[PDB]
Amino acid sequence: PIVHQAISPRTLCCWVKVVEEKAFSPEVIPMFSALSEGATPQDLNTMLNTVGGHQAAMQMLKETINEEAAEWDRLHMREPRGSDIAGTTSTLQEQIGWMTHNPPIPVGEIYKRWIILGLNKIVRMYSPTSILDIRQGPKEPFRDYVDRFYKTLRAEQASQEVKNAATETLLVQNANPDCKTILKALGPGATLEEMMTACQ
Amino acid sequence: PIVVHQAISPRTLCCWVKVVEEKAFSPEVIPMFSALSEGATPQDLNTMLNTVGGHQAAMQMLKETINEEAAEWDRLHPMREPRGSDIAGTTSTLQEQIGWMTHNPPIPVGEIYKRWIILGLNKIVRMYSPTSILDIRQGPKEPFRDYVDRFYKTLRAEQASQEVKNAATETLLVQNANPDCKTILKALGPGATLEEMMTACQ
Amino acid sequence: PIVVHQAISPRTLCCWVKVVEEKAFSPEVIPMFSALSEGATPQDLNTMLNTVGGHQAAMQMLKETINEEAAEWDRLHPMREPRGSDIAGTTSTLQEQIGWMTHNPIPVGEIYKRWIILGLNKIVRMYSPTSILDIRQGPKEPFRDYVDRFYKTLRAEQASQEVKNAATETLLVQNANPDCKTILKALGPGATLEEMMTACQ
Amino acid sequence: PIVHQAISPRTLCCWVKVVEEKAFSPEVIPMFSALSEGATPQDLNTMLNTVGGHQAAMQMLKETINEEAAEWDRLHPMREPRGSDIAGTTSTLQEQIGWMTIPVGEIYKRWIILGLNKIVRMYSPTSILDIRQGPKEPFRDYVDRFYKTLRAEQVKNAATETLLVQNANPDCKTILKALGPGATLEEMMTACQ
Amino acid sequence: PIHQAISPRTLCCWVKVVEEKAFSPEVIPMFSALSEGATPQDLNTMLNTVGGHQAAMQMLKETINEEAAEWDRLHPMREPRGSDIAGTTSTLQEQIGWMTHNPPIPVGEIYKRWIILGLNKIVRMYSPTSILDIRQGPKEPFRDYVDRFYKTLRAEQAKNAATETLLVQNANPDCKTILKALGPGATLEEMMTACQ
Numbered sequence A: 001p002i003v004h005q006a007i008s009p010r011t012l013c014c015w016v017k018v019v020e021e022k023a024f025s026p027e028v029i030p031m032f033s034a035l036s037e038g039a040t041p042q043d044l045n046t047m048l049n050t051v052g053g054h055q056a057a058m059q060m061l062k063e064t065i066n067e068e069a070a071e072w073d074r075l076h077m078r079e080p081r082g083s084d085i086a087g088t089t090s091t092l093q094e095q096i097g098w099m100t101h102n103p104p105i106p107v108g109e110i111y112k113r114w115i116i117l118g119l120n121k122i123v124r125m126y127s128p129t130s131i132l133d134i135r136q137g138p139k140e141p142f143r144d145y146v147d148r149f150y151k152t153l154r155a156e157q158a159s160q161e162v163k164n165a166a167t168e169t170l171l172v173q174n175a176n177p178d179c180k181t182i183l184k185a186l187g188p189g190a191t192l193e194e195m196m197t198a199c200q
Numbered sequence B: 001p002i003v004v005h006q007a008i009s010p011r012t013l014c015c016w017v018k019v020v021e022e023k024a025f026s027p028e029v030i031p032m033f034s035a036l037s038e039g040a041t042p043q044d045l046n047t048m049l050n051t052v053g054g055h056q057a058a059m060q061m062l063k064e065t066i067n068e069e070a071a072e073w074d075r076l077h078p079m080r081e082p083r084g085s086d087i088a089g090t091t092s093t094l095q096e097q098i099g100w101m102t103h104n105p106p107i108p109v110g111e112i113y114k115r116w117i118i119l120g121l122n123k124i125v126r127m128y129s130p131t132s133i134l135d136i137r138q139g140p141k142e143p144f145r146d147y148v149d150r151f152y153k154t155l156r157a158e159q160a161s162q163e164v165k166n167a168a169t170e171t172l173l174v175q176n177a178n179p180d181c182k183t184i185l186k187a188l189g190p191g192a193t194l195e196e197m198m199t200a201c202q
Numbered sequence C: 001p002i003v004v005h006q007a008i009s010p011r012t013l014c015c016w017v018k019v020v021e022e023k024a025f026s027p028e029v030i031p032m033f034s035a036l037s038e039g040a041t042p043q044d045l046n047t048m049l050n051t052v053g054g055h056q057a058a059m060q061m062l063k064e065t066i067n068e069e070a071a072e073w074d075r076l077h078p079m080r081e082p083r084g085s086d087i088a089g090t091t092s093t094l095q096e097q098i099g100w101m102t103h104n105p106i107p108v109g110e111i112y113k114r115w116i117i118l119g120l121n122k123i124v125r126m127y128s129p130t131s132i133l134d135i136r137q138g139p140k141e142p143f144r145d146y147v148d149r150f151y152k153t154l155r156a157e158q159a160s161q162e163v164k165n166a167a168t169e170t171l172l173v174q175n176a177n178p179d180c181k182t183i184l185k186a187l188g189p190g191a192t193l194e195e196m197m198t199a200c201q
Numbered sequence D: 001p002i003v004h005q006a007i008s009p010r011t012l013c014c015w016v017k018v019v020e021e022k023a024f025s026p027e028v029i030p031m032f033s034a035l036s037e038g039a040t041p042q043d044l045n046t047m048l049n050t051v052g053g054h055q056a057a058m059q060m061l062k063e064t065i066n067e068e069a070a071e072w073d074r075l076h077p078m079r080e081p082r083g084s085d086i087a088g089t090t091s092t093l094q095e096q097i098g099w100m101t102i103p104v105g106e107i108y109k110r111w112i113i114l115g116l117n118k119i120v121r122m123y124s125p126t127s128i129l130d131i132r133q134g135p136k137e138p139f140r141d142y143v144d145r146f147y148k149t150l151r152a153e154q155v156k157n158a159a160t161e162t163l164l165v166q167n168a169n170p171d172c173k174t175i176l177k178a179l180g181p182g183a184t185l186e187e188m189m190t191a192c193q
Numbered sequence E: 001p002i003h004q005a006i007s008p009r010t011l012c013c014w015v016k017v018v019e020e021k022a023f024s025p026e027v028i029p030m031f032s033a034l035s036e037g038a039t040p041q042d043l044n045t046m047l048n049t050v051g052g053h054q055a056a057m058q059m060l061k062e063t064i065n066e067e068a069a070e071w072d073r074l075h076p077m078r079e080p081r082g083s084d085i086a087g088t089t090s091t092l093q094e095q096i097g098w099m100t101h102n103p104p105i106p107v108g109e110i111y112k113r114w115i116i117l118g119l120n121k122i123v124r125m126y127s128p129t130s131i132l133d134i135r136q137g138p139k140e141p142f143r144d145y146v147d148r149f150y151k152t153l154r155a156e157q158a159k160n161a162a163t164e165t166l167l168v169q170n171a172n173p174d175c176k177t178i179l180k181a182l183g184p185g186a187t188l189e190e191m192m193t194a195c196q
């Protein structure tokens, strides 16, 4: 991070604990983006290395980083190439110069964008169930069904405009017969609080 | 957060996630949240709310409550002035929020967004404990300590007015107790403090 | 706290919550509390007590003890002077507390912490119902575990340090199971705990 | 670490928690290297002492440190720092502070990291060629184990493509053979899911 | 510490360490590192927060009393007595004065010496088995046997020749033969690789 303080312990320890506990859920992307503020490519690589397990997801993230680096190289101190942004062929001093020079070339931000895109891909892939396939079970409380529905919806990552249409149609459509009837009788526009209180 | 523009510290986010994971949604989550988000800007509050794993239904209800409060703000309040969606950090850059919060007289957008979030959290906590104070009753072979713990947890979750707190706590504790401990407590005499009651019922 | 009025730090609250959750209510919670709340204002102490999950009965008893101490203060002690409910932070703004504690040469925060510590001592004494005289070594229980339980109950009781020596010396040997009782009686007077445990283990 | 403030608690505590939870996996090397920034030899020894358990791995690390110290003494015959001076066994804190304020810390950390790499390679006994998908084993878990072993062993990339076909259960073997060459890992896993 | 009160993170980490590791040798360096410049009151606060193991804490208190009596015999603001070093009969102001006076009276260092001696005793008591009694089991992996052997060695805190010969001596028949055939001077990595 940029002075140029070395990545703090607490940050790495918390990042490791997060990736271990939460597995790969949408909350890993904001957490990551918040723990890697102003981080240089070397620091981002140190963060990604400390990730235990999930090595398939890490390999897929590395593949996405290589794809973005190839695209950068095709479209484009010395100028930074694609593998230069990923911190494979650039010293910490070169990165510090690139990011601190005036005008600056924020290589850290670019690498973090690539990593966050890869993480979005990973999150979408770790939630295989589609919005249209989730339906309330027979003897399943409505709360658990709503939780699963909204978790899958956040994993899919569709535009908020489509978010509203899906939230309103699919939630009512896939409800079990009892709660389906209760909700259909509740009336249109019924807020989520009213539905949850009615079904409980 | 502001205290310059320091980025939200790691410890804060990590502890907030750990709290929301461990305690689920209990009354102690509201003070914890309010204490971990001191001087936090709207973007930081949204970063905190995003890191909350699971409980996505409660987060949707919180978002709906925030939209309601924002509509009310816009109705009451038609650099530039901050609109409703600017307080919630949906249509305002970090620089605009910092400018609003650093001016004098400052427009504390952070405090307002935190008020809205705390109202939503009160709703969530009250809804996650569906049993009412008047519906909670001591079991047959349940020690008095466990019944008192459940009773006071439900009472703090309902969070009504203080007069309710005192009257309900003592009257309902004696009323809903099991027959044996009910008799023991009624024999203890009026004014009985909780310590004496627990010592008698053990 | 006033070190300027710094807000209660996150790490402190998180460690306090984790401590109260893991250890339940054991004597070691009181020193921990007193050490984590240095110079804390009444609002900060209330924030700490609020974040305590579960154990709501003990917290209500603590609130009742705080009310008792506030009533005693109000009786003994009739900006303005702080009444009982002002010390507990129920009828005083953060600014009034900061002024009271920062005025040269009345640290109300320390007083509120004294009250809370008295309440916590009562709570700890109540959470250990067994008395020192009721603890006795089991049939096939290692001597180390019996000593651990004995000294845990002794620290929980919070009696006068005067009775500590008499009880530790007489009762520890008295409440031992027959085999280790004979071994220790043969060890001879003036033995240290290390020697006793080495002999029994 | 270089003023010379004493090693902070948080660093030691996180190091202990990491070494305990993750045992000895490749992710321990970056963690160690990041937690010991500017640390003096005494600080590195304080870190190594607090490591609970895994005493066999710690003894192997100590032997590797002695080997590297002997090699240093052979290559390199205030005063000059000997081998046992870098390892902090025959040097006072003041001499270390003077030398680093000759980066003894970086050299000692290089030795320790080499030993830790050896330890990690030894903690993963399974070879890349022995891992094969089970009968009722999800493909994701098989891929995770494969890449974990590959990272532990530290050509590899070329081998990955052959091993993918090799470690494929008959059903998944047919699916992969039909998928066609040059299939990316994302596409491959999406097809096999 | 040197006089801010002991920070939260330090106390919380100390409690978690004493809980997790129980009483193992690695607790002594950790303790010595967490109490740098700590006053006697801070050391007492650290020792109080230790949950459980109250027998070991009583033994530590007895060791502290022994060392305080020895000090009082050897050395018969005011001069610090035995109970003054342990923070039992001295106010925070007296400790701050003793430690801040130009002639350093290290109450922290002396109390920490006493506490570390007691803790070494406790650790030695928690590992009753001797190095010469440890032997590889019938169906026990060689790695676990080496780990137990070296843990016991660290508990004994007594060396290289004996440890290395006894390691091969106390092995299981199969691994004993394998190691004896491996040849002298083989490193532990090679031995473990052969026995794997």
Ligand SMILES: CC(C)(C#Cc1ccc(-c2ccc(Cl)c3c(NS(=O)(=O)C4CC4)nn(CC(F)F)c23)c([C@H](Cc2cc(F)cc(F)c2)NC(=O)Cn2nc(C(F)F)c3c2C(F)(F)[C@@H]2C[C@H]32)n1)S(C)(=O)=O
Pocket: A030, A033, A034, A150, A151, A153, A154, A160, A163, B043, B046, B047, B049, B050, B052, B056, B059, B060, B062, B063, B066, B067, B088, B089, B090
């Ligand atoms: C990328 C960064 C910089 C960011 C951000 C950012 C900015 C604004 C908002 C935000 C704040 C307040 C409101 Cl009112 C709305 C809102 N209202 S609205 O009804 O759409 C109507 C106005 C159109 N929309 N947004 C998202 C915006 F993009 F429009 C809002 C958000 C909010 C923060 C938030 C989360 C939460 F849990 C509860 C809560 F109170 C607020 N994030 C999301 O809600 C994310 N999410 N998306 C969905 C979708 F799957 F359904 C869902 C959520 C879920 F909430 F988790 C809940 C599962 C359903 N983050 S960074 C690194 O910091 O991550």
Ligand SMILES: CC(C)(C#Cc1ccc(-c2ccc(Cl)c3c(NS(=O)(=O)C4CC4)nn(CC(F)F)c23)c([C@H](Cc2cc(F)cc(F)c2)NC(=O)Cn2nc(C(F)F)c3c2C(F)(F)[C@@H]2C[C@H]32)n1)S(C)(=O)=O
Pocket: B030, B031, B034, B152, B153, B155, B156, B157, B162, B165, B169, C043, C046, C047, C049, C050, C056, C059, C060, C062, C063, C064, C066, C067, C088, C089, C090
């Ligand atoms: C919103 C913020 C700013 C706040 C606050 C604030 C202010 C004052 C007090 C407080 C302090 C001292 C006293 Cl003596 C009383 C008191 N005495 S009284 O008997 O009512 C009689 C005088 C009328 N009342 N109050 C609450 C006040 F609002 F009246 C008192 C409190 C106290 C702090 C406290 C909690 C605790 F656990 C133990 C303890 F020692 C003290 N909070 C509550 O007690 C909250 N609570 N409410 C109830 C109800 F379900 F029964 C219960 C509690 C429970 F304690 F958790 C316990 C389950 C039963 N918080 S913030 C962000 O920091 O949250």
Ligand SMILES: CC(C)(C#Cc1ccc(-c2ccc(Cl)c3c(NS(=O)(=O)C4CC4)nn(CC(F)F)c23)c([C@H](Cc2cc(F)cc(F)c2)NC(=O)Cn2nc(C(F)F)c3c2C(F)(F)[C@@H]2C[C@H]32)n1)S(C)(=O)=O
Pocket: C031, C034, C151, C152, C154, C155, C161, C164, E041, E044, E045, E047, E048, E050, E054, E057, E058, E060, E061, E062, E064, E065, E083, E086, E087, E088
């Ligand atoms: C209130 C505050 C400010 C305090 C304090 C304070 C002051 C002095 C001492 C202390 C230090 C050194 C020694 Cl030698 C003695 C000692 N020697 S003596 O044999 O009594 C003989 C001289 C008469 N007595 N004291 C207590 C004093 F008050 F006299 C000693 C202590 C010590 C600190 C300590 C704890 C420990 F775990 C191990 C250890 F090494 C030292 N605390 C106690 O021992 C507490 N305790 N009390 C008993 C009783 F149930 F048996 C027991 C303990 C138990 F240890 F936990 C162990 C279970 C048995 N704390 S605060 C906020 O910081 O809490």
Ligand SMILES: CC(C)(C#Cc1ccc(-c2ccc(Cl)c3c(NS(=O)(=O)C4CC4)nn(CC(F)F)c23)c([C@H](Cc2cc(F)cc(F)c2)NC(=O)Cn2nc(C(F)F)c3c2C(F)(F)[C@@H]2C[C@H]32)n1)S(C)(=O)=O
Pocket: D042, D045, D046, D048, D049, D051, D055, D058, D059, D061, D062, D063, D065, D066, D087, D088, D089, E029, E032, E150, E151, E153, E154, E155, E157
């Ligand atoms: C008291 C303080 C200040 C200290 C210290 C200090 C100083 C030097 C060394 C040290 C550093 C490098 C080397 Cl090469 C050797 C070495 N090489 S040698 O083969 O003996 C041959 C030269 C004679 N000896 N020493 C110890 C010295 F005293 F001689 C070495 C050590 C080292 C640090 C270290 C630990 C580790 F885990 C792995 C590692 F790589 C290095 N500590 C020990 O090893 C401690 N230990 N002792 C034994 C005994 F039971 F077998 C064992 C260990 C065990 F390692 F845990 C492993 C279980 C077997 N600490 S403080 C507060 O910071 O604690």
Ligand SMILES: CC(C)(C#Cc1ccc(-c2ccc(Cl)c3c(NS(=O)(=O)C4CC4)nn(CC(F)F)c23)c([C@H](Cc2cc(F)cc(F)c2)NC(=O)Cn2nc(C(F)F)c3c2C(F)(F)[C@@H]2C[C@H]32)n1)S(C)(=O)=O
Pocket: A042, A045, A046, A048, A049, A051, A055, A058, A059, A061, A062, A063, A065, A066, A086, A087, A088, D029, D030, D033, D147, D148, D150, D151, D152, D156
């Ligand atoms: C020693 C220090 C200083 C370091 C470092 C350093 C430098 C560059 C890179 C790096 C960054 C970006 C890219 Cl694109 C590549 C890349 N692309 S490539 O496909 O090889 C093709 C270009 C040739 N290779 N490298 C490694 C380089 F050395 F070549 C890349 C790395 C990266 C950082 C990273 C880790 C991750 F989890 C996901 C991710 F996105 C990126 N580390 C590794 O990937 C390590 N690893 N090695 C293998 C091997 F078993 F297969 C595997 C990984 C695994 F990723 F974990 C995944 C299991 C498979 N670390 S320190 C103290 O900080 O540790």
